[PDB]
């Protein structure tokens, strides 16, 4: 089918990409980076995140595969020595697909912008602590004072979320997880402290108290947002699809990345 390959852009990844293109040329496979059905990312998880965002408008037509030319990735979970086996099984096709949940982020300013996240979306201020009201399904839950907030997908829970004390969640769970960054807690200021895990259809709204300018990130992409009225989080109806050719369980990937490999 139509496929394309993104590369980290160092010599090792660029050369592996060229060798895989050569191997695909021996099958009924057409290189097409406009409407691919297969997107192969060669690099690390950063490269994979960029592949996801390059093709976020055609997620339901695409199966993603990641090859890690460095250390094992949570998305780039194939080794370069298996690239030839990958070309072979990918050309034939008929592989099974695995789908992970995504996070929808809506930013309102007086209009709306929407974003999809594979890892997480975070909100911080223009320096120092900021203040946001946290509203869950239209009920005021807490006034947060601190460095920021992080809302993670299940597959993102091993990323920023983990460093913030969040739980690691198996990606078959359709949920998002909100973690705090250095909240102030004293007699006057009060937050929940604990990470919060939300099911599908719950909406978490972050609303300004004084300052209306925030730094909002979606995966690696961080942009200063001015005149923001609201940041709304919910589990997306869209999913990312992976081509899988062998069993590599999430919990084994967690073991291999954090425990020992």
């Amino acid at each position: 089918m139509k496929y394309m390959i993104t590369s980290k852009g160092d010599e090792k990844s660029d050369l592996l990409r060229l060798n895989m293109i050569a191997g695909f040329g021996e099958y009924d496979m057409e290189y097409d980076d406009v409407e691919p059905e297969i997107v192969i990312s060669i690099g690390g998880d950063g490269t994979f995140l960029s592949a996801f965002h390059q093709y976020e408008e055609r997620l339901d037509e695409i199966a993603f595969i990641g090859i890690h030319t460095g250390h094992l990735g949570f998305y780039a979970d194939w080794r370069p020595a298996e690239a030839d086996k990958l070309v072979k099984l990918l050309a034939k096709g008929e592989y099974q697909k695995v789908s992970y949940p995504l996070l929808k982020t809506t930013v309102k300013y007086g209009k709306e912008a929407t974003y999809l996240a594979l890892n997480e979306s975070t909100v911080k201020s223009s320096g120092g602590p900021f203040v946001v009201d946290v509203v869950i399904n239209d009920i005021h839950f807490e006034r947060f004072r601190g460095d920021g907030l992080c809302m993670s997908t299940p597959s993102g829970t091993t990323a920023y979320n983990k460093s913030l004390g969040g739980a690691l969640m198996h990606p078959s769970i359709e949920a998002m997880q909100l973690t705090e960054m250095a909240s102030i807690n004293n007699r006057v200021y009060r937050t929940i402290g604990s990470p919060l895990v939300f099911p599908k259809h719950h909406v978490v709204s972050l609303q300004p108290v004084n300052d209306k300018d925030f730094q909002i990130s979606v995966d690696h992409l961080s942009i200063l947002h001015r005149d923001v009225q609201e940041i709304r989080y919910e589990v997306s109806a869209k999913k990312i699809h992976f081509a899988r050719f062998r069993s590599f369980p999430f919990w084994r990937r967690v073991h291999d990345s954090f425990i020992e490999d």
Copy 2:
């Protein structure tokens, strides 16, 4: 229908129980503590946990209601001033039911004992640190050295799980959450650290390394287990059913118990 009322056993709860029995006597409602269809717990969450375990063999035939004669409870979420309104709406019936997930704990010793938990099940040793191998879906995930491990239901996440750094999970999510108690981490010993959230059908097995005697708790009930070969955790196929008469969202209950009320 058939109903019964458990009491914390102080004067306030005992008297409220007698007044509710009097009120039920004006409707087609029969007091029956052998095969009730409605179980009302008057006290706090401890009283409610005990009601759950008193009737754990007939969970699919029972709707539970909790009245808190002290502070607001996560299970005992009705005020005593509303007991008369409760009798009224309960006698008529036709209320909606809400169901929360439960945790199945299997203890193997060379035979099996199974237990159901509404809050959590924990494993500790006979003093000092103990060592257990943690096996997830038959793959060895970590060797845990420390004080113990806690496996929580969603509604249990606001209990022991929270004090151990776990995430708070909305109880519509069919999952269990494993948290660590003071794990040892150095160059030689390694655990994940982070809480782990498992979906239905995942099995987490705790297996001895040296000592085979453990203290195992299920909700409040803690018993020394000798010659243990394995402790297996999975989300139960059984659920607890609550009678609900008004909206009291989980996230509002969290707000009211931990943020302000």
Copy 3:
């Protein structure tokens, strides 16, 4: 003696300041904001931090006093109702002085700038995670990847340090405490995790790995630093002096601010 009064600048603080100046006019007390021997801060801890920095070059000639016109402060630990009693005991003088340790921050760029902190100094990057080598007394201790690092004085331990998981340290201890902000830890990246407490004469050096631009804060003052070669932390030889008129123990101040009041 020579004294001055800084105000938060709202009506309540401005009026209390004018009334205290009137009261001081009945004693041998001269208002002098160039070379005061007594600096009274009326507001909150932010106002007090600003008073400290306004007079950081004459710290050994000054005794500070803070009045909190809002909630109790850790520095502004006097109530406005006692301002008249304060004027009285301050005019007479001969009060005892209490001294807290300070943090010296040296920034090297190829020259040096030095700063004094009463709460803490922090280092962050120009967005996303940054990388710094942490060198303790000239031995490489860790390569830190994450959001930033915080080095706190003892009296600062109840501030940002606390929100980052640091220990609360009694201010009679001549030490500084380093805490992490969201460190990355996986098979490849490794930090200590735990807060670190350093005695006097230990030097902690933060050194760039790739990017050389950082955001450095000293108490409230945050400035972008370009072409930084090193940030060095050590307990200062200078101390801040408080005028004390009654016993208000640090641990009682902690109790009153975080437990109940």
Copy 4:
């Protein structure tokens, strides 16, 4: 001088002990385990803790040395390959001594028992959560509900204290650090959460609320205490003395044990 050697008791440690005794026999060195001036511990930190407690009544007459026949220890910080060099430099003598602070634990029951700790002393209940009032220098600071409390020496901060979230403190600091084990925090129950670091001469008193029976540990030794009225903690006036023959800085020992070696 008079010396003795304790062994872990496995073949490797027993044989190294016999070889060191043979080497000492070539110098003016007398084996004496009643009144040694040098105590050499061969094993790990557990063996070293036991050596300390074997000779806790003659701490000011003894310099301790630890050899680790397994992984590097924080107390057993010499390698077995250097035992011959150790015998040599130890026989000559005139080495420098390094002293670490200790923790005094006083247990009152209606009489007093006192204990010295090199790592920590902890208090837990006879199962489930217990309740203790925490009194600092005779002022009630908090009512703690949870699993237990840990009071650590500086050199103990890398042990249980670290697993509980405590700060790592350089052992030149004369202090003790109190950490919580799974405290309950809700609208009704409130603790500080943060580790607390106390200077010399501060006294932290733990006092019963209901149950008067506790499990009290001092280093490895854990004993059920009945009819306890109070547990008092303070930095001891006594210190442990180490014989040092080369520079092995505490922060390098921390690096080597937790970061990489």
